[PDB]
Assembly symmetry: C3
Homo-oligomer: 337 residues x 3
Amino acid sequence: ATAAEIAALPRQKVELVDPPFVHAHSQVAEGGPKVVEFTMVIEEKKIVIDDAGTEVHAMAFNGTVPGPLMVVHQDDYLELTLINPETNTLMHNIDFHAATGALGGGGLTEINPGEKTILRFKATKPGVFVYHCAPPGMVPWHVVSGMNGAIMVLPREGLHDGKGKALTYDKIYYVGEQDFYVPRDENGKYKKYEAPGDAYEDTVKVMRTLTPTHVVFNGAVGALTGDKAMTAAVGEKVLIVHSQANRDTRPHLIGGHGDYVWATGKFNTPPDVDQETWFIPGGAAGAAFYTFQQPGIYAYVNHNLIEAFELGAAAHFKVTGEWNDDLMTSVLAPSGT
Amino acid sequence: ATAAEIAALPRQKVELVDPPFVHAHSQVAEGGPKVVEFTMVIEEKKIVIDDAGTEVHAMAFNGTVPGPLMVVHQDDYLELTLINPETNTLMHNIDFHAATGALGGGGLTEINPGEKTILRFKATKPGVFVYHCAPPGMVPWHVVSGMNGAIMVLPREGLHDGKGKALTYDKIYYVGEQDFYVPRDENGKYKKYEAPGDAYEDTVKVMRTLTPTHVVFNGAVGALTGDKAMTAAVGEKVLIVHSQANRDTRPHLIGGHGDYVWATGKFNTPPDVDQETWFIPGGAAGAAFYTFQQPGIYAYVNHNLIEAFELGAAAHFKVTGEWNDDLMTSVLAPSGT
Amino acid sequence: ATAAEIAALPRQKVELVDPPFVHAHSQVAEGGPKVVEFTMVIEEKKIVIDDAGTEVHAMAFNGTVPGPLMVVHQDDYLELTLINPETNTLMHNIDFHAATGALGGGGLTEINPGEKTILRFKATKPGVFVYHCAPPGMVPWHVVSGMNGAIMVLPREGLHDGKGKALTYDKIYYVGEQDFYVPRDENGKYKKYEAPGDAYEDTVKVMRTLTPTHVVFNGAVGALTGDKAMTAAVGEKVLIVHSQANRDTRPHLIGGHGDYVWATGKFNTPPDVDQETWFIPGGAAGAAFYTFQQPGIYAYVNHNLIEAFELGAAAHFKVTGEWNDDLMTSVLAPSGT
Ligand SMILES: [Cu+2]
Ligand SMILES: [Cu+2]
Ligand SMILES: [Cu+2]
Ligand SMILES: [Cu+2]
Ligand SMILES: [Cu+2]
Ligand SMILES: [Cu+2]
């Protein structure tokens, strides 16, 4: 499109929504290409990540770990205002894996405390994609401090299966998975630090072991379990976007499947089908579409079950509706022999 | 199908055999849906997993690690009678990744020692699938004590390539790969215990390192080597099902290929072809079809070669037949320069 | 077919070049099947892998880590003369994942110092494939000492996308990724040894932790940076072949994508498209095709960002040409809030 064309496109501001929920959007694009505008303030803040009071100095886009899902359509532009307040201690930036050029945007968005920047890019490829902070020389420390999220660039005609038939979800959830590396003293007690930088050398030591101390969804052990379970009903179609900016994961819905899974995250790559456990490499997002058929509790886990049930990578779904005895039935309930 | 329709279907009782062998079955289904009946008794027992006498308190479906492969066809019902004898010490259950509802069956099959249960589920999706025990609060401990196996839900038509041409094996094997986490004392010797619960806390400590002490096929170092090799002949078509319920693996046939690999394990996802090394994420099963072209010894490994050749994840195939010098030949045998 | 027929085929003697470059070849085969001849001399040699001066006794095909890329076309024959000079200490051999029979060639090419051998195999499957040394009882030690490389078996008609459209690259690089396991003294400084075998025991104890101390491209931290950065231009089509003979990797071009990615490395498996981060399991090679659209610096990394930026797995590209503000622009450069 020529210059004048780009400048005349509609601009639209969107209010973000914290994970695992997602801001207002339409599956099939509304109108032609537009510039979708978002604002995020970076917050450096201590968070508690487990039920032992373990602390991390999180580096949080929009104040959450993960950062929020932004949704646009292919060939829209994403225009982000990124703000680094003067109460923060570090420079930050942003790298969108959906974008082309300048290290994903990281070369154009280095903001010290007290600065802001506005980056625009054309979302030329459809898929879910990671975004993360990447300051030169300190890239993994920011990412493993929680400074990452995802976007979704929907096809203009919405999602389709591998034969081109529409796939239209009723609900979407975004599960960001975070590996944390929390230092411990010689008694095995997690350490606490006054300011983010005080932890840098001890944290890189743990990072070099390649073994996280915690692997969590939505920023903390248990953040999406119990009273915080996600919800659905029998018959509803749910899209589950999952990202992991630094380390591999292998999602699984305990009691369900991924009926269609873009395991690479990219919508022009046909989805796998009927999956039990899919694989999302570190540095990527994936998305799974499932129609719920049975009510009750499900878990949603990274299926290294030690990561899920010892280190924190487990969520719940609570599903309403009527039980299907064709699909499963207890012929003889547990009883004495 | 209605409850009465299911009650009228034919029943077939299968006798399971121990991995890496597979029970008798037909690739193409005979006739219409059936209720395929299986029984497994759970055995808690010490197993020795290496040549140094290292022990695991195994929790073994049908007394083996992995548990046996169960074979059905799409839209059959799998009816399992699961028995937990009074000689065991723990509650157990079963979660079938092929099933829909109640945590794969785990919510309906919780059996204390001295109980049994009967679960039926409809095998609605074709593929190879993990099953495993998953008692609330104790899930990865049971799995990494060997309490896992797989099933195969064949298409009613049998297997096909990505162009719907039939693929018919002459032979099938089931390789269950197991990560074990064995505690060591201050001198580096593996510890022994006299009841499963006595090893729990020390085991969990090793599990949280994410670093197995052993990675084995069929429950031990060397289980599928030497005179317990898998066997085949030149011209024979072989399907190798491989599962890993907790940790990723990357199978490779040394000297061969995966001609067709359903690396996700799901038969409605078209297979990869001409594979050197495929990838099966923790929590899944995959399957590889190969036609042997050369005789001699092959190795079948997890191609993290430290996991294969230091930790235990290596099997052999012995193949009969005539050498093909067109495919390969020693032009000059090793000799002085 | 027969010996008369194979004697009649043309021979082509190729001179290998050092990675990341690739010897001259034709993407579409010039004429009928040929016997493509290569020679490699194995060198046991001390190499320095980081700016601290850390050393590995490398075991290097052609003197480099990785070994060089050999390029043939499907149904050519690859005929390798492999020489183990008398100045080396160990027996070595070669196992081509591209080849069929005798453990990939391993069984036929065991040469002591002062010996040579010539192996010929038919390259029946198109793709990129790992090769590596594999002496029985010492397999992972040789591979993780750098004794591995890759070959490319091009379709005779050159590369195509999943739908039959030709994909012709303008240039090709070969990135070999190497996990090294270097012992450390009680100060945590890397140890040095006199001969390869002096480090064996201490190296095996690091290998069994499954945690490399360094993960590098082209044999050292920073090897593909600075005057050794890869290069391209806006509009240029680049194929990046990447291998890892022992351990998984997840390549990512920072600021770009993989437009077409044969993540399994096999050209009869249609490529994934629009990739952010692809996944190549240990024991495999993959290849990604990308048309550069923006000038400037890029990094090409294993996107476990601790592996990339702490352990060494980061290369650079320098790209010339004109910035595209439609793809990306800084609407407001970093500036005061
Ligand atoms: Cu940051
Ligand atoms: Cu990134
Ligand atoms: Cu159990
Ligand atoms: Cu499971
Ligand atoms: Cu060697
Ligand atoms: Cu190999």
